[PDB]
Amino acid sequence: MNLMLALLTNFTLATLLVIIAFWLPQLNVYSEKTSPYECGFDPMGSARLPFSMKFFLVAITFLLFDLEIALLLPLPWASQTANLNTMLTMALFLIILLAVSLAYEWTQKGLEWTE
Amino acid sequence: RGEYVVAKLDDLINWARRSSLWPMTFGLACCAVEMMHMAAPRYDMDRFGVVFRASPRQSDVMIVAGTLTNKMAPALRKVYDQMPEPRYVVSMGSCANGGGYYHYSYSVVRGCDRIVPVDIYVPGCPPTAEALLYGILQLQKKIKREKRLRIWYRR
Amino acid sequence: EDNKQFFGRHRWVIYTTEMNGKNTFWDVDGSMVPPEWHRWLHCMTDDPPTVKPPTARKFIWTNHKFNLSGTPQQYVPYSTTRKKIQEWVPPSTPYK
Amino acid sequence: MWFEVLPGIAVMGVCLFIPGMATARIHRFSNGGKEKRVAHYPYQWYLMERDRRVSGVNRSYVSKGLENID
Amino acid sequence: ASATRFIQWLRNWASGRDLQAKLQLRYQEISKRTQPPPKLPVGPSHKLSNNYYCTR
Amino acid sequence: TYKYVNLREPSMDMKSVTDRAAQTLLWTELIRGLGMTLSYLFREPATINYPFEKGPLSPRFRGEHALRRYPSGEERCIACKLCEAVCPAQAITIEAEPRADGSRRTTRYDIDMTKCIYCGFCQEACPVDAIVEGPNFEFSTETHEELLYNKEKLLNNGDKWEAEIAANIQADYLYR
Amino acid sequence: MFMINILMLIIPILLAVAFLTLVERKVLGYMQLRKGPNVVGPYGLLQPIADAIKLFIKEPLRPATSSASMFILAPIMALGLALTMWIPLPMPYPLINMNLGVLFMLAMSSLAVYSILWSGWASNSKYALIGALRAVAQTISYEVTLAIILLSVLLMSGSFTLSTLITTQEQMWLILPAWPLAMMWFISTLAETNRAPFDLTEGESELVSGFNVEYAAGPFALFFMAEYANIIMMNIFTAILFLGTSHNPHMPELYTINFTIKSLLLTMSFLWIRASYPRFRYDQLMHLLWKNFLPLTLALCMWHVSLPILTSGIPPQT
Amino acid sequence: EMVRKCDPHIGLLHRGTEKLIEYKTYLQALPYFDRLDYVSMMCNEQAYSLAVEKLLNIRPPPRAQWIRVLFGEITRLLNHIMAVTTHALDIGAMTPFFWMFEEREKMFEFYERVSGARMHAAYVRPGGVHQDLPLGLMDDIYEFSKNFSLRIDELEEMLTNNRIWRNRTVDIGIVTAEDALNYGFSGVMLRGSGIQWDLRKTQPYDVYDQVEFDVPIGSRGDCYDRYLCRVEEMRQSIRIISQCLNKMPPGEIKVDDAKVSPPKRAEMKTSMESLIHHFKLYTEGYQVPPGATYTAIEAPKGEFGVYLVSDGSSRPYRCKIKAPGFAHLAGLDKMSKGHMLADVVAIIGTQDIVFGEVDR
Numbered sequence A: 001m002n003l004m005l006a007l008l009t010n011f012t013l014a015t016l017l018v019i020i021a022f023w024l025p026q027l028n029v030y031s032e033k034t035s036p037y038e039c040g041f042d043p044m045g046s047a048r049l050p051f052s053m054k055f056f057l058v059a060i061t062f063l064l065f066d067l068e069i070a071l072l073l074p075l076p077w078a079s080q081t082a083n084l085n086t087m088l089t090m091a092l093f094l095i096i097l098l099a100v101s102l103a104y105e106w107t108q109k110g111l112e113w114t115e
Numbered sequence B: 001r002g003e004y005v006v007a008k009l010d011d012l013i014n015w016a017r018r019s020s021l022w023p024m025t026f027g028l029a030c031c032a033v034e035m036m037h038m039a040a041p042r043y044d045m046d047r048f049g050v051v052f053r054a055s056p057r058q059s060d061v062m063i064v065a066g067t068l069t070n071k072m073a074p075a076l077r078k079v080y081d082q083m084p085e086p087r088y089v090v091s092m093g094s095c096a097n098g099g100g101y102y103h104y105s106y107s108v109v110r111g112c113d114r115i116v117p118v119d120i121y122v123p124g125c126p127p128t129a130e131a132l133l134y135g136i137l138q139l140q141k142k143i144k145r146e147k148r149l150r151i152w153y154r155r
Numbered sequence C: 001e002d003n004k005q006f007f008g009r010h011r012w013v014i015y016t017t018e019m020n021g022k023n024t025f026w027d028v029d030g031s032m033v034p035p036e037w038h039r040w041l042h043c044m045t046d047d048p049p050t051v052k053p054p055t056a057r058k059f060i061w062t063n064h065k066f067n068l069s070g071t072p073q074q075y076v077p078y079s080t081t082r083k084k085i086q087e088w089v090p091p092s093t094p095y096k
Numbered sequence D: 001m002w003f004e005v006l007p008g009i010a011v012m013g014v015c016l017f018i019p020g021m022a023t024a025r026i027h028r029f030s031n032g033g034k035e036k037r038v039a040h041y042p043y044q045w046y047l048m049e050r051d052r053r054v055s056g057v058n059r060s061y062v063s064k065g066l067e068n069i070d
Numbered sequence E: 001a002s003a004t005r006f007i008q009w010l011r012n013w014a015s016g017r018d019l020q021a022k023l024q025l026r027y028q029e030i031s032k033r034t035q036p037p038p039k040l041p042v043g044p045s046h047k048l049s050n051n052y053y054c055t056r
Numbered sequence F: 001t002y003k004y005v006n007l008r009e010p011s012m013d014m015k016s017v018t019d020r021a022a023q024t025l026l027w028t029e030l031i032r033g034l035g036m037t038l039s040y041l042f043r044e045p046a047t048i049n050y051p052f053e054k055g056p057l058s059p060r061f062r063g064e065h066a067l068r069r070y071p072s073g074e075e076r077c078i079a080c081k082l083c084e085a086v087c088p089a090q091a092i093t094i095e096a097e098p099r100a101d102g103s104r105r106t107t108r109y110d111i112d113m114t115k116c117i118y119c120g121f122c123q124e125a126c127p128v129d130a131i132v133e134g135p136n137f138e139f140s141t142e143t144h145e146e147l148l149y150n151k152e153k154l155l156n157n158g159d160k161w162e163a164e165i166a167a168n169i170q171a172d173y174l175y176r
Numbered sequence G: 001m002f003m004i005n006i007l008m009l010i011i012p013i014l015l016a017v018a019f020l021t022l023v024e025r026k027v028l029g030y031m032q033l034r035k036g037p038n039v040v041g042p043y044g045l046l047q048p049i050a051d052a053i054k055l056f057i058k059e060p061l062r063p064a065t066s067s068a069s070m071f072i073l074a075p076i077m078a079l080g081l082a083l084t085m086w087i088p089l090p091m092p093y094p095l096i097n098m099n100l101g102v103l104f105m106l107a108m109s110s111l112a113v114y115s116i117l118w119s120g121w122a123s124n125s126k127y128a129l130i131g132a133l134r135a136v137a138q139t140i141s142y143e144v145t146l147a148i149i150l151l152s153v154l155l156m157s158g159s160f161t162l163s164t165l166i167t168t169q170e171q172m173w174l175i176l177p178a179w180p181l182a183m184m185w186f187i188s189t190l191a192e193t194n195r196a197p198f199d200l201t202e203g204e205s206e207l208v209s210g211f212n213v214e215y216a217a218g219p220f221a222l223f224f225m226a227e228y229a230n231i232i233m234m235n236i237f238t239a240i241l242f243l244g245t246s247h248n249p250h251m252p253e254l255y256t257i258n259f260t261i262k263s264l265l266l267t268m269s270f271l272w273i274r275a276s277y278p279r280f281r282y283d284q285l286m287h288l289l290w291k292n293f294l295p296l297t298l299a300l301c302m303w304h305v306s307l308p309i310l311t312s313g314i315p316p317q318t
Numbered sequence H: 001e002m003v004r005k006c007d008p009h010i011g012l013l014h015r016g017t018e019k020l021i022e023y024k025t026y027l028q029a030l031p032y033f034d035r036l037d038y039v040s041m042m043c044n045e046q047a048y049s050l051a052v053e054k055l056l057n058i059r060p061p062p063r064a065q066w067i068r069v070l071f072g073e074i075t076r077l078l079n080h081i082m083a084v085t086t087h088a089l090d091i092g093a094m095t096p097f098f099w100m101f102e103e104r105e106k107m108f109e110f111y112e113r114v115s116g117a118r119m120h121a122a123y124v125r126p127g128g129v130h131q132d133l134p135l136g137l138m139d140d141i142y143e144f145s146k147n148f149s150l151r152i153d154e155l156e157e158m159l160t161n162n163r164i165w166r167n168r169t170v171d172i173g174i175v176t177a178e179d180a181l182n183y184g185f186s187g188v189m190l191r192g193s194g195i196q197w198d199l200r201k202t203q204p205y206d207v208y209d210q211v212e213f214d215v216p217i218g219s220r221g222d223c224y225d226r227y228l229c230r231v232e233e234m235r236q237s238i239r240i241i242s243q244c245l246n247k248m249p250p251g252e253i254k255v256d257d258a259k260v261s262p263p264k265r266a267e268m269k270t271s272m273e274s275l276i277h278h279f280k281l282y283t284e285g286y287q288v289p290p291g292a293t294y295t296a297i298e299a300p301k302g303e304f305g306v307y308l309v310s311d312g313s314s315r316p317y318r319c320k321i322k323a324p325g326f327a328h329l330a331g332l333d334k335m336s337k338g339h340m341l342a343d344v345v346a347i348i349g350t351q352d353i354v355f356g357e358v359d360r
């Protein structure tokens, strides 16, 4: 109940501030005022055109490494077990394989952005 | 009384606007160098609440510091148009006032006031950093005497 | 003045609260400094007007006026030459 | 001078002090002058819901000592 | 130049220099704003004889 | 004679390699950059309290224009038009005619202060010290038209700032 | 009395953010041999009040090419989520006492990124788009390093509860046993808050204003308020993580004063840094955290899993 | 964000200076030159004055040549402070801008105390200078110069060894020595690639052959070596200023030929020949013999010259201005190959571009 009421208050305050912003001030809207900004000259093309990602390979690798935090975050609880020898072995094995993945991509020029 | 209240509200918004002037980061020619020295430590325009911001959509003041040419004139009008109101224009230097040294050129606009409205004209070539700061404090006094709400109250 | 302050901050003026009928408690202006003190305040000289007064002339303004732009006292440009071509005035009596 | 920056830090510091102080004092006011009971695990929640029943007034922060056994 | 001895030590240490020796703010070591009048010299052509213009 | 700015070979002894290793791992040369900005925080700022304090100027300062008089009140300008001929911006327009007493005087003396480049060539060329650039620089206006000075406005400027103008010419005329 | 507690949190936060803008302008001013705001109010104390009123009585514009629903959703999301990251912070008593508070802040910090991506995309402007995709690169850069740096520290605390970090540092700050981790954590909060030298989503001198180039008036203020509420929060987090404060249950105010001072000093270091260094290229930020911090963080993560086991110093689960 | 092509569009500050000069006298055309490279005002005046004096076949007096070198090197400090700190401002480092622009403010007072204008002095003219230094100025220049070296040290403490600054500038915008010559580069753009060239030493003008200074030379041809060259040139300018403050000779400050330089006002009001020459030199101007010259100086931004054509009258026939930034900016497309958007921001600042001179 408390958490939900705390969230409602934060996003209600955020919403009411936006509402005041649009209804309190005096507005004078015309075409040139709302045109897209490109430093003074009309944009040459649409902003919705394709935008090449030079770090696409590193972005895919982020998906795989971002799943290691899910597997690594239980470690504080894992250290409470009575099977410490097994737990410590698999904790280090899992982190090491995460490191070998980094080493492979680094050495194979995978972290270098495409020209 | 209603006239008293609108007078005090007018003094509040007028105060807020003149105490938080945000010039657009917009300079054209030598006059922009003297505008840099007004931001330099000796004069420190930031202490008056005057802060440069690059986006025209977050600016309250346009300082036309330098020469305005026919090629650049459409760009100036565009960035002026993209300024949310209330917006004030300060014309700095002979070139931006009436063409200055290049009044009779095929490629120069004889005054920025042919392209945009102008609130304060700062003379000089260039005006000293302390002369531009006089124009900014003269603009603030102009905003201090606005009667937007009082004029509304008796429409 | 305070000569222990660094150059630029060693001279200053506390503006009057009234000048030429205008309330200046809050609305001070750089143009309110009369010319004789304008030279000392800007470090164009070391001697103040009280130690070395300006030369007296009967045409010098006795009353200093600050920047009048935006007021009814502002300056309006106009041509100071007289008319150049004089038009013919027809007779006021019918010829018939 | 630099110490003219302090007034802006003092106001900022006072604003950062209020949230912690207000929560600490509001908890005392809402739990009979004690810390709010922390229940991170079911055992602690089980004891808090037992305190409600024992209190006889449906409040878990109303303690009952040896005066309530006889 | 009005800094206390402690603040002078702190700022000298934080930068590694002796700042007080070379202050970037000017003080009474500048020239007087009133100066004695000059008497500038004249050029080589200020002569009353042997100074015809067709020779220079 | 020339010098190299970035032609140096780093030492390779174990103590120099470790020193660079400590710099890489402990950010020593970045901590040193912090120490320089900390020093400025404890210096007196260079800001002046405008308009209660003014930036220093000199007697040669080229500010607002003014037309001067002789000590008797007669105008110094005698409509020679040297200022109009030398003005780089053609900001000066002059007309003249014999005055009612037969004196060579002007009927129009306009300076378009929006064409002017405040160069001082006019006061250099004036043979009677009539047109000068004064010490005033705080004369911004709310309209363009107020910057088209005519003769009446220029004589008013001269009569207003004469006390200061005369003292500045007295301080600099031997350099001229 | 809970609603009063919420208001006694967000309202003081919005006031501290307002005067942090003043404090930054004056601290930047004196490190630049000038003063900063000193005219509007005594010593500039009314400058934030003048700026707030000015922005909220100014005209807001929706660009003709914008996607309105997302264009207006983004500023609401930014400020709504910047205030939501304070509710689990123990000062010393959290408003919301969470058993996984460290996880909660991680989750909210990843959701607050979309207030940048949707802001920049919805504006339908090239500079807003370039700014938005710099936030994708920035998040890819620090997210893995940030999470594993937290994990290494939590292996000495033993729980994800923020209030437990108070008990862990009852004898000594964690800056001593984990100074290498504190260095990387501090840099990762600079990247995570889009602060100089990692202010790339805005990048004034490159993208004019970046992801919020098209925003005006109140909507812009919400992004600015969210930005400054995050840096205070990320430094309160740092003070709790590495500069623990003693908690006397009979003097809960002494904790707050001491804890508030450290947070102010860490926040001042953000302004100190912004005045001292240039800006990384955003591809150089990726290589900083993948080729330097990640190899070290992985090694330190293994070290802190083994060190408690080999010294018999595993912290309690509860 | 990779830059595939740079297409600079200029002319947004094209004002027709070269066409307007054709309607002015040689004196009326001088203030135009303060407004081309409006960070190097007195250096632009000197290049124009050297060209007119060359066509006039006259020589400025020795004391004027020392003032022109002295204020030529104060101006180089003004330009390099503007170039380095704005270059650093665009890269994210904003603090140095404020420290050094309090040093530019003090050097503007030297401008203001010799001419009356902070920037557009119009002080250096064909024949010498306009007025003698006021008493006490050289003492104030000595005091400013005595401390300026520390100001540069503080600038270097922030940038030179900073690893973030080196990342933004090392191996960015590499230009080969062969390409630099063919693309028309000059100044630090040549010296950064290792070319040993400087007009102050190879083709000296005024009294630059009577002073001692070292020309910095780069090794990599990148933005970092050109930053080191500019910071080291500021140090050498202080070295020259010390020698100009001690070797300053006495004498007149403009050529003692009243058909070129106007007479003193005291003589103009007492002598018939002096009033006639004052009258003609301010209405018609001095006729310049027919002929065309190309005269160049080592301006702060590179080789600045004018191809001045005279037809025998008092007004120039043609005045072509060679702005060093015009050639540098033309090379922005070659130097940006293989770089990102943020690197082009660094390349623009390393070229030291001001569009008053590029566009004229």
Ligand SMILES: COC1=C(OC)C(=O)C(C/C=C(\C)CC/C=C(/C)CC/C=C(/C)CC/C=C(/C)CC/C=C(/C)CC/C=C(/C)CC/C=C(/C)CC/C=C(/C)CC/C=C(\C)CCC=C(C)C)=C(C)C1=O
Residues within 6 Å of the ligand: B025, B026, B027, B028, B029, B030, B032, B033, B035, B036, B039, B046, B051, B052, B066, G014, G015, G017, G018, G021, G024, G025, G028, G048, G051, G052, G055, G220, G221, G222, G224, G225, H039, H082, H086, H089, H094, H097, H353, H354, H355
């Ligand atoms: C020489 O050759 C040439 C160039 O080459 C350099 C050129 O360039 C140009 C072109 C010139 C120009 C475009 C203009 C140049 C002018 C200058 C002044 C630039 C010179 C250098 C500078 C360093 C100037 C200023 C720049 C910086 C980076 C200084 C840093 C200091 C600042 C104060 C900037 C902003 C800093 C901070 C900390 C934030 C302040 C910002 C705000 C918007 C204020 C606070 C914000 C709010 C949203 C309000 C707060 C409160 C809220 C929101 C409400 C909360 C409370 C509630 C109750 C809700 C020309 C012609 C040229 O010839």
Ligand SMILES: CCCCCCCCCCCCCCCCCC(=O)OC[C@H](COP(=O)(O)OCCN)OC(=O)CCCCCCCCCCCCCCCCC
Residues within 6 Å of the ligand: F012, F013, F014, F015, F018
């Ligand atoms: C003495 C200080 C003790 C306290 C330091 C504690 C911090 C340790 C981390 C820093 C590394 C220092 C410790 C390494 C040994 C240093 C002492 C040493 O190497 O002997 C000195 C000797 C003199 O060097 P010199 O002959 O001039 O040239 C090198 C030629 N091989 O050099 C030699 O010639 C011997 C051979 C040198 C090569 C050995 C390999 C050194 C590099 C391996 C990595 C060391 C760091 C590993 C730890 C990383 C984590 C910090």
Ligand code: SF4
Residues within 6 Å of the ligand: B029, B030, B031, B065, B066, B067, B092, B093, B094, B095, B096, B100, B101, B124, B125, B126, B127, F117, H035
């Ligand atoms: S008014 Fe003067 S300083 Fe300003 S741009 Fe024109 S010529 Fe340059």
Ligand code: SF4
Residues within 6 Å of the ligand: F083, F086, F087, F088, F089, F090, F091, F092, F111, F115, F116, F117, F118, F119, F120, F121, F122, F123, F133
């Ligand atoms: S100062 Fe120069 S531009 Fe202005 S009126 Fe005099 S001669 Fe003309």
Ligand code: SF4
Residues within 6 Å of the ligand: F076, F077, F078, F079, F080, F081, F082, F083, F084, F094, F122, F125, F126, F127, F128, F129, F130, F131
């Ligand atoms: S002001 Fe002087 S130069 Fe101009 S017309 Fe009058 S007398 Fe001649």
